[PDB]
Amino acid sequence: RGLRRLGRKIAHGVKKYGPTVLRIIRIAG
């Protein structure tokens, strides 16, 4: 769980979260 562009960028924070943040905001307010 390190990748953050090789594949873990498009999803992550949406597929598991719902919104999209995380790998973009990594905050999710």
Side-chain angles (χ1 to χ4, degrees), residues 11-28:
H12 256 1
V14 83
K15 264 179 135 132
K16 10 294 246 224
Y17 272 10
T20 192
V21 330
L22 204 187
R23 285 309 321 157
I24 39 150
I25 343 183
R26 340 238 226 83
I27 306 128

